[PDB]
Design a protein around this ligand. Structure first.
Ligand SMILES: Nc1nc2c(c(=O)[nH]1)N[C@H]1C(S)=C(S)[C@@H](COP(=O)(O)O)O[C@H]1N2
Ligand SMILES: Nc1nc2c(c(=O)[nH]1)N[C@H]1C(S)=C(S)[C@@H](COP(=O)(O)O)O[C@H]1N2
Ligand SMILES: [Cl-]
Ligand SMILES: [Cl-]
Ligand SMILES: [Mo]
Ligand SMILES: [Mo]
Lengths: 372, 372
């Protein structure tokens, strides 16, 4: 059994796949803290988790001339000044289950928790590429490809890429992280090294990093070429052409209600509605609107989190609204967020449906009742 | 009469205000060419158009030390290498009239044409600021403020600002343009010099430029402080607080059908539906979905325009779809676009309504009939 070596996990996780392991924190905890504890941080693994011996570990990074720099874990910690970045990882498949309610899709049935936040610490990718000899700017469209230590039966490793410009930008904060929420990277989250690409879909943050290579083309791996792309709602498995859409990089504006939960009965009087909101590309969320009546009237919720500099809002904003509720009434609780370029979330799922169930950002609707 | 000196305009424009002059090209022409002819390019003036004598004209630019560089038109053309940028200007109030159909708003009643595209030529703002002595990077949050030659009765000039980082970035392409579609700037469009801020709302492209100043704060002008901001649909004229929302800079994904027009009767057989689509922040539009039945089924339209580099899609994409139509049927034609960070347009206007009628990006719906 190729999965016998996997780490043990926290017992309260909402597991949707045991092998390979994929799970999300329970929604009643998801937004309980700004930083998600390492043991509740959602996990997405495509393969068995690699067992890595710290000192024999080497990160291979290909130089501009065809040579190969070979860094050990200790050298990565001491050569480069440690940088810390608090960033939210949201999986492309977050909220896929709401899509399945319209028309079945292919994929892990995530609810609203394929997203978590953490303070990451490690080397700036930028610094590692400069040390390897690359210039700050290459002419044309270049990419930085990553490969993990985890590989399938037939030898292919999980892989992804980001544009060279993003890798080199001081502002973009791309890290080769070896620390998570102040402790070392847990095995499930990439020990000893992973890439963390703030503002960008989870798929690009390659875990258990074994190689970094600069290339004129995107990563040729299956997960970069033939997956994680958005299509028209009309497209199906026989008409789908992966060359007609760009690989998902930055994600659109997103939000969900974490309290209360669907079906709940809530005491009359006052109700505190809580949730998260986030946007890709470092775009700050500037407002969250909340509705108790299915989206015909709205009030502005209160935002917490900490103002990050412009174009660098890598972390979610948690929100709450305490509102008056009348005994024996029916509520349809809805939330929607607005980002700094004023992008908004769409009303319904059907018009954004796609065969892979990714990019599910329609309003989150929660139905509950007020106790008599 | 303070407006006696205004330029004459093309006779076929859809004028919504004569003084000050505000007009849009007729929708049947809007998307007829990729570059909008200077005489049809939409015009938004807040005040009378300034009469400027070329040789006595001086652009005042404040240096880092409190000094003042003073450039003439000839020096602006010869000191700095001319750069050309094709960029679409969309006004914050575009499609405001669709908002008014839900609940009256305050503002010029634009239809779908408060948007146009042109090839601009002039000095890079960047180069002008470096010549003035500024560094490529200032610590903290800085702004570059602009003031036009046009001023109200009580002396205040039209003004706006953009973040310093945007002004200095080579990639961002901010220009002090003196040419438009190969000829000199027409008076209505800012002769002799205007700022052109690609990917950003029209309001920031200050026309008839008289001053450029770097400041730790945003432009203090009315149009930067107490206008051009987005609010919750619940907010009204007595609860509105302009300090709770950011000045609009980058705009969200947008699209509209230009052919056919509402109410048209179209021959049976085949129908070519045409329109535009655009997104702010240099984000390319990657798809346009078109529906003939009110948005329940969709087909992918065909895109034209020319692939710009990543993060620099400053120009709209024109689109068309030739579709089969049955005699004696009713059609509700709808279009929606998707940008490179996968942002999408919302289904309905009501949930994005705001008191100023700005940021109108819900699906454009056109109802027509097929002739028997
Ligand atoms: N090596 C490797 N990295 C990977 C993956 C993987 O299967 N293998 N999954 C990816 C995807 S789809 C996601 S959403 C994130 C999730 O990271 P997390 O498990 O630490 O939350 O890891 C990315 N990095
Ligand atoms: N000096 C000056 N610049 C200005 C304006 C103005 O009133 N005065 N209007 C602004 C706004 S709201 C818009 S939408 C654009 C429109 O530019 P255009 O008239 O060339 O299309 O100009 C901007 N620049
Ligand atoms: Cl997934
Ligand atoms: Cl307006
Ligand atoms: Mo993912
Ligand atoms: Mo405007």
């Amino acid at each position: 059994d190729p999965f016998a070596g996997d780490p043990p996990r926290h017992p309260g996780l909402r597991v949707n796949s045991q092998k390979p392991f994929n799970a999300e924190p329970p929604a009643e905890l998801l937004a309980e803290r700004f930083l998600t504890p390492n043991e509740l941080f959602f996990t997405q693994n495509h393969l068995p988790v690699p067992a890595v011996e710290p000192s024999s570990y080497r990160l291979r990074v290909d130089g501009p001339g065809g040579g190969t720099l070979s860094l050990s874990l200790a050298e990565l910690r001491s050569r480069f000044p440690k940088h810390e970045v608090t960033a939210t990882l949201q999986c492309a498949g977050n909220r896929r289950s709401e899509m399945s309610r319209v028309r079945p899709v292919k994929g892990l049935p995530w609810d609203i928790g394929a997203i978590s936040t953490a303070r990451w610490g490690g080397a700036r990718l930028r610094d590692v590429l400069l040390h390897a000899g690359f210039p700050e700017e290459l002419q044309g469209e270049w990419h930085v490809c990553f490969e993990g230590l985890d590989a399938d039966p037939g030898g292919a490793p999980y892989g992804a890429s980001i544009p060279y410009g993003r890798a080199l930008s001081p502002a973009a904060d791309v890290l080769l992280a070896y620390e998570m929420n102040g402790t070392e990277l847990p095995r499930d989250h990439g020990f000893p090294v992973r890439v963390v690409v703030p503002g960008v879909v989870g798929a690009r943050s390659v875990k258990w990093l074994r190689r970094v290579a600069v290339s004129p083309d995107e990563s040729p791996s299956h997960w970069q070429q033939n997956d994680y792309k958005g299509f028209s709602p009309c497209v199906d498995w026989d008409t789908v052409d992966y060359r007609t859409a760009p690989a998902i990089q930055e994600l659109p504006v997103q939000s969900a209600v974490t309290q209360p939960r669907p079906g709940a009965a809530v005491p009359p009087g006052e109700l505190t509605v809580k949730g998260y909101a986030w946007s890709g590309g470092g775009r700050e969320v500037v407002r969250v609107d909340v509705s108790l009546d299915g989206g015909r009237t709205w009030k502005v919720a209160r935002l917490m989190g900490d103002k990050a500099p412009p174009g660098r809002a890598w972390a979610w904003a948690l929100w709450e609204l305490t509102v008056p509720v009348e005994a024996g009434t029916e509520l349809e609780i809805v939330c929607k967020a607005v980002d700094s370029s004023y992008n908004v979330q769409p009303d319904s799922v059907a018009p954004i449906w796609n065969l892979r169930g990714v990019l599910s950002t329609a309003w989150h609707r929660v139905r509950v009742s007020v106790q008599d």
